[PDB]
Design a protein around this ligand. Structure first.
Ligand SMILES: NS(=O)(=O)c1ccc(Nc2cc(OC3CCCCC3)nc3ncnn23)cc1
Length: 290
């Protein structure tokens, strides 16, 4: 900590407070995360994350494990997608910039997924943007290293809006498909300027998904009915049209979105396949206003 002069609180992250800080010796401006907790397995896992380098992954600069405490030092980025969505809500983020952002995030996912590393907790607050038009994923890999709690150290409720249905149904093992689900949710929210599934409990989250995509059954999701938290008693809603769900989105975007939101994680499109989808045929990289 003392190697760093705290500039300001960015805010309270999943695992502890996050600060903009300056490296008092190198001049480097960084995001400093204190990890609220020791454990040798978290140490070796975090150490593996140091090598997982990609232009759309927030760079982990250093792990500081001193005085039985853990700090992570990241590349600093000045804005998150939530702030940027809020800032541009009168008109929406332009479609070419949505496409650029989705394309870059899928490249980041594809890279981490090829190394068997998952995010598990994608959300506008951990998608970070710069002035060169780049978008980057923050906190990749941390969930496996430390977990995902219900509440933060500060009692802020962790959001369920981007949680994949297999998680809500009590899947014990997560696949890369959970990140594709979240990213699809974020894609829809960029387009409509409304969260897709703003649940405020697990059942509310599940039943919001169900009311939009239809209650899943054995037809669309082989094995759904034997999942831990599946209840035969769930109401059986019918699916709605994507035309009604994400209106302005064109037929390519709707078609991609549909594949990122398949119930069965095995049927859900991979980041690699999604990058080849016709939706990206005219992708470009605009500069955002910021
Ligand atoms: N002003 S802002 O748009 O809210 C914003 C958002 C994000 C940052 N930077 C940030 C934030 C961050 O974690 C966030 C997660 C959500 C709670 C606040 C900390 N991790 C990071 N790694 C590199 N930059 N960085 C700075 C400002």
């Amino acid at each position: 900590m003392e190697n760093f002069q705290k500039v300001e609180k960015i805010g309270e992250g999943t695992y502890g407070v996050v600060y903009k800080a300056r490296n008092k010796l190198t001049g480097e401006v960084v995001a400093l995360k204190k990890i609220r907790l020791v454990p040798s397995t978290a140490i070796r896992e975090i150490s593996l994350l140091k090598e997982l380098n990609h232009p759309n992954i927030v760079k982990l600069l250093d792990v500081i494990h001193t005085e039985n405490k853990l700090y992570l030092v990241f590349e600093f980025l000045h804005q998150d997608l939530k702030k940027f969505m809020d800032a541009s809500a009168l008109t929406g983020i332009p479609l070419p910039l949505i496409k650029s952002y989705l394309f870059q995030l899928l490249q980041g996912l594809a890279f981490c997924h090829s190394h068997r590393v998952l995010h598990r907790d994608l959300k506008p607050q951990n998608l970070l943007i710069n002035t060169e038009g780049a978008i980057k994923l923050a906190d990749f890999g941390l969930a496996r290293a430390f977990g995902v709690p219900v509440r933060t150290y500060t009692h802020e409720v962790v959001t369920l809006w981007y949680r994949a249905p297999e998680i809500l149904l009590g899947c014990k093992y997560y696949s890369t498909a959970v990140d594709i689900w979240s990213l699809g949710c974020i894609f829809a929210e960029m387009v409509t300027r409304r969260a897709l599934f703003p649940g405020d409990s697990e059942i509310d989250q599940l039943f919001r998904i169900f009311r939009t995509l239809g209650t899943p059954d054995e037809v669309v999701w082989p094995g759904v009915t034997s999942m831990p938290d599946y209840k035969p008693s769930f109401p059986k809603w019918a699916r709605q049209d994507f035309s009604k769900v994400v209106p302005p989105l064109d037929e390519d975007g709707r078609s991609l979105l549909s594949q990122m939101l398949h119930y069965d994680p095995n049927k859900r499109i991979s980041a690699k396949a999604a990058l080849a989808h016709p939706f990206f045929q005219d992708v470009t990289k605009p500069v955002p206003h910021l």
